[PDB]
Amino acid sequence: NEYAEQAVLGSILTEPELIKECPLTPEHFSPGKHFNIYFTMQDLDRKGQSVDFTSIAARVGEKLPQLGGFGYLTELAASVASTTTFKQHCQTVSEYFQKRKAISIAQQIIENVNVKPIQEAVSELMEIEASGTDDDDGSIDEALVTVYEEIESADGNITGVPSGFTELDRMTYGYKRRNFVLIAARPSMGKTAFALKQAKNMSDNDDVVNLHSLEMGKKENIKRLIVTAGSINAQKIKAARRDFASEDWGKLSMAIGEISNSNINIFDKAGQSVNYIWSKTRQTKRKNPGKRVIVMIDYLQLLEPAKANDSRTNQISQISRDLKKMARELDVVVIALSQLSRQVEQRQDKRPMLSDLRESGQLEQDADIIEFLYRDDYYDKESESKNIVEVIIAKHRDGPVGTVSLAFIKEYGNFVNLE
Amino acid sequence: NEYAEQAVLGSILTEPELIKECPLTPEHFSPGKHFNIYFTMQDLDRKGQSVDFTSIAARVGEKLPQLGGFGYLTELAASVASTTTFKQHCQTVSEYFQKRKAISIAQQIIENVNVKPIQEAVSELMEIEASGTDDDDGSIDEALVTVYEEIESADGNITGVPSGFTELDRMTYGYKRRNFVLIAARPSMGKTAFALKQAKNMSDNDDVVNLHSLEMGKKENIKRLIVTAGSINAQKIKAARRDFASEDWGKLSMAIGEISNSNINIFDKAGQSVNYIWSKTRQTKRKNPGKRVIVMIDYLQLLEPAKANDSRTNQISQISRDLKKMARELDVVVIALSQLSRQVEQRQDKRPMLSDLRESGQLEQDADIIEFLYRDDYYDKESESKNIVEVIIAKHRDGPVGTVSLAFIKEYGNFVNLE
Amino acid sequence: NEYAEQAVLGSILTEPELIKECPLTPEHFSPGKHFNIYFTMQDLDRKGQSVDFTSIAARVGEKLPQLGGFGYLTELAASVASTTTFKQHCQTVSEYFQKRKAISIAQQIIENVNVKPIQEAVSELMEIEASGTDDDDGSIDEALVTVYEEIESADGNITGVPSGFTELDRMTYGYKRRNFVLIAARPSMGKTAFALKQAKNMSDNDDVVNLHSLEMGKKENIKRLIVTAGSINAQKIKAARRDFASEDWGKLSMAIGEISNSNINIFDKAGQSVNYIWSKTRQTKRKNPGKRVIVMIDYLQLLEPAKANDSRTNQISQISRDLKKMARELDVVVIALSQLSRQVEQRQDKRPMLSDLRESGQLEQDADIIEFLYRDDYYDKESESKNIVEVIIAKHRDGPVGTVSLAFIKEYGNFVNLE
Amino acid sequence: NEYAEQAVLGSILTEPELIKECPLTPEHFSPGKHFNIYFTMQDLDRKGQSVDFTSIAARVGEKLPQLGGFGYLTELAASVASTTTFKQHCQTVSEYFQKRKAISIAQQIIENVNVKPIQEAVSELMEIEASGTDDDDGSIDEALVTVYEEIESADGNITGVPSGFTELDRMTYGYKRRNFVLIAARPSMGKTAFALKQAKNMSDNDDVVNLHSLEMGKKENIKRLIVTAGSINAQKIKAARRDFASEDWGKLSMAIGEISNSNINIFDKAGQSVNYIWSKTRQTKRKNPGKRVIVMIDYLQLLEPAKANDSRTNQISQISRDLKKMARELDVVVIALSQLSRQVEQRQDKRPMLSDLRESGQLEQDADIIEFLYRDDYYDKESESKNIVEVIIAKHRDGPVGTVSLAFIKEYGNFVNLE
Amino acid sequence: WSKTRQTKRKNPGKRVIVMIDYLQLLEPAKANDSRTNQISQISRDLKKMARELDVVVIALSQLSRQVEQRQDKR
């Protein structure tokens, strides 16, 4: 493969520090040019210098033409649009390298065998396993050095996006940028109102919240954001309002302002693919420079899969995996509401655990902060925890676990701090 | 169209992040080149990578010429002057795609028709609808600027279709238009009479109720509506009536009027598919303009599935999911009576919960207002709640939960309001 | 289709009142004649008159030849053998109409598309659905009046064929004429003896009972009818009898009379198709004028299906559907004994419900009076209900449900009334 | 034959109700016309309609000419003088159908034989039998008059084949001739010894017992028949015997005589198909005229199915159904030992019921006298029923159910009577 | 397994221990299978590895939530 080969050579001529980020030998590259382009390129690194046109053409002054001339070094560097695909190309060059030797060690056996052909299948076995050199594994460093950084160094207060619950942020220090949190729970636990709360709290810390409600309407989501903001009674407004409530118009003419003075964006298209949300995320991130973006989803299961004709358990995987990628590659907080197996209500302890994520397999694995919601006063009419939702962080990849308690005001869809 | 088709392919080969900002399938593009130019282009994206000449030509190393050779990819990327018209061109391509399938589904009917051409106009219908797919919305505030004018329009009461139980409507404010409510319960709880009550109550609020009794006959449903309307004794009429009851003919010659002066429509075909009900719903909605329509079903389980040879647990899902769509896309209240697992009677608290919806999985998820019925005087001969059914709203999507009590008159199949 | 078209036009020219019983438009008919034969035919009904040769030719006097001349009208009238097929043909005429418009709206899209082809799929959608209203649909009152006709004529004795159990006939008022009742139950519950009882009871009310025993012999069915009629001990006779029982010869020389003086007919051909039973029912009904006929079947599953090479679950459907048709079209009580899923015995409450009808799907739907049998003293050696079979009516289309208890005399295969 | 073929098709087009009065398939009629004339004629009936020229020509609108054109249907209808010879002709067509398939199944063997040609003669035999057709209708008389006989001929004792247990035969009166009894039970209950007991008891009543032991050897079955007959201790003989037991040689030199003086026949081929047993039954019945034959099977599950590649649950059905046929068509008592679900031992009452016949579905249905065995002193070391097997008749088609108790002598494999 | 051979190959002569922070978070072989069979598929496979690869296999696990509904939480 010459195409990916050029990108590698060029991207290195562009960033004379990438020869280090990806290890190779001229043996990988095509004969002649690409070969000499790296042989001389690698030598200048082992001799402890820099690798650029100027230096390369300065090394082999007389034998410069054997590298395609100078006019080629420049053509290679020009061919590379962006040095972001370097990894992906440095792998395509590596895959084809194993490919080349896999044959060279296969037709090696044939000629070698014909002395019993036993030690052959033995010697030709150890070589084939040497082709099992991983690019992804578990080494020593790279981490220890970055284990440093500002973190260990200095800091106070929340680094990332605050949830709005003092006792929760004292564990996460704000949902990061690449994280993919999961807010799952049984029906009628505040699964939605808990989301619409964090939605505003983030919009108050001057962040952008993209609410993708595939289940509800652009309206009800606001109607809820108001009844939660002004602390007005949920039942009052609905229909009574006009000739039933008074002095609340003060709390109303205030909430109506707050919601319009917020950074809440609501998308309510019926069928939303993970790719759809993706597009609307770039767009919102482009129109809004400098500021962080959070993408909420009101139902992981109501999302539209990529392959219509596929097993359900694979669709949720297709979704989950894709959702994570988005957070990582787009650098935005991805919060996805989910549902828990109906099997939770057939136990003595109605408290959700990870296994309760029914179909979704590749789910719990791609999630960074799985947090279940639990209202005890739903299964028990006589609970010692009257009106208390307990947010259960069952998984934190870069932090600790534990249960956080919040006071749930059923009437305003509001959550209160404790402790 | 090839012209706008080039622009799309090219503008993507220039901005390898645009494949996301506009969803397509190779099916949109011309045969061979443009097709393979996207197929391979799309694949690289699904594998979580980038999409540029270098990467594309790197993928299909031997089969590159089938994409017009490398000399074509560059020509496509040079053809695009600016990636600003991408939206306009990605639409031109999208319009021509529908056009391609509109014909493919038109000349589909023709050949298909030539059994009865009914299932044709049905199968050729569900396909054509999978083409109205591109709401050019995607904003934040647009229908959000209109959520203030219906808070002042909060005149008085009940916005949607009233249940007829003062204490219930003070929670739902009338079953909405897209909702899918579920009236489940054990046998002998009033499951049916409770339905036939709401049936009329709505026909009094001048709404249309489509009662689909798959279990009973068009007669018994009326015979019950009468014994409920006139408050006449249920046992009397049956047979005795003639020479057993007197001065009830006043209550009879009145009820017989009410029922005939009502908007109750009863369908009693033995085997009813969700699609059958669908057809009868459009028809009723067409003949009756301006007025709201409610669709009641006397047995979610007695409905005829779509795929005869399928797992039972998948049939109830096929039904449930379909039933919801109907309510959403046809804009009518869908009320479906259901039955609860026989497993409820092997507990100490005979009070139904969500997990009691046995086979049905995708059920509780597609339901908006799951409401179980419970008569305490059935499991207990000495109950402190003599003749009291308690309607248990276990799930409300746009509202609160809780239990509502009503007085059940076993003899008249009537339900009375309380404090 | 001209053949069916003629039938429709003719049968109308024969029954100038059928134009109402089947709604059409000239559009449905072929061009020229058939078209004008209806357009002028319909016109005459709209102007509130009568449709006959005399009248039609009276209308279009000068333009009569454009209807094929008078000679044609007469020919059409003569073509109709019996106005019985009118429905069937008026449907063939209707089906072809949809097909004509289906193409018309299909080749409509093609020319319409080539503006954005969106409103096309939309306009071409409304039309494709607006192709259903042609035959019988949804209504009400035409039955209300009938629901009332049977109220004042509620004399009080049994209208149809009596079961022979006072407490059962007080629910059914005699199995009607078009009904298809289902006597299902587990093995060793009296499933057969309960049938052979109703068998005689009907032959005593002077009705004819055709007993199709596919499992047993023409003899055992009699041997049982005797041991049940004379109340003689079942074990005595068998082999002992001669030199073991005395003074029973009175009860024997009485029973043998009763059975030969009865209207019981027993068919015991090994393989009986639903069509076989059909033929034997016509024959019996023909030979016996004026009197009602009841057809019993000792095993719904031992019936021979129509399509040998077909899925079992479809065979029981093929049978069930056909069996009902017989009862409807031949106007006879059809009682079929059935068996319940072996799965009943793996529960705590051995009491049968409808779901226990295993394979049979189209079964519970086509049945009018599903009645299960249950002997409690089979599963419990110490039952408070010693020798008590409880007949459980789980489905009554034109009546109520509930459980009826009878005293089962194991020794005589006799059933006794209670309360 | 075409002449009688026309009369049938014609007399039906004349009387559209005769298609029912005589069953046929298009396969009976000549190719092309007559074939299609019935294929489309039959379809219209299955869809619940009529069958006349007008209706048929209406069905196949375009494809009418393939039925000989309209001008042929009429010709057929006109060719029928009187619809009185319909039966006579419907038989002439039928005879010619058997003749057609008799050849097709004859020249079938020829080509088929060309694996051992055994399963050929077998599969070619089952087909040739599906052609024997002799019967009419039914009355009662001719059979009624026979129900007498067995009263006058009822001398008082066992009619059929005696089990050998006084308290069991007082319920069955000897296993009949067409019956298919089932002796199922858990391992270690005497399932086998109970069989080998009835085996001899029948051989003493001068009947023939064919013991098919697929699990054991021809030897062990005898070794058991001896230890049971002479009442010698089972452990003694085994190996000790020679120099361990004395004065038993009297009981031995007597039993060895009994077994050799018995009518017991033992087959022990490893893989036995139901058809294998069939052949060996005819042979034994042919060689032994006038006497009754019983066919025992030591493991219903160890029998070799007919279709190797089929679902297990269908194999036991294939066996069970076949096993019954044999008993019926060969007129011999079929006793088949079986095993019960391992699920029996996970309950409080270890007493077997019908639902415990695991895989086998069409089993309990084809069985006439299912009798489970239960030793209480196996699950309970301290039972009040020391050494007591209880034979549980759970199903009796022509008799009553109930439990019979017998004393089990573990040491001699002997069963003793009680009461 | 693969990452164990690799580590054992790169490091000759020395013993290798394989720790697992959650026996239940391991990905089973057959996705569509009963949960109780998956943990069996894992467990059985995990042992084979230790045996056939000759390395110490330590697997952290979790105990039924049913432990906390007794008097002795042991």
Added chain:
Amino acid sequence: WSKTRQTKRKNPGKRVIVMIDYLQLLEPAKANDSRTNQISQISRDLKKMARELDVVVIALSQLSRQVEQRQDKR
């Protein structure tokens, strides 16, 4: 099976017994199959061996963990 023929061949005239320390740890024939069918595949095959090879086959097994939730642990 193979190791049984071999041992029976090298050792003429004498009887052979084949013990197995775990019926469940044996490797099935069809990797992609239901667990309950694998033990059936093994069991059935194990018997055939004893019969056709004419050797005593002793197989150690394990009992359901369900035994310890009863009063009689027998």
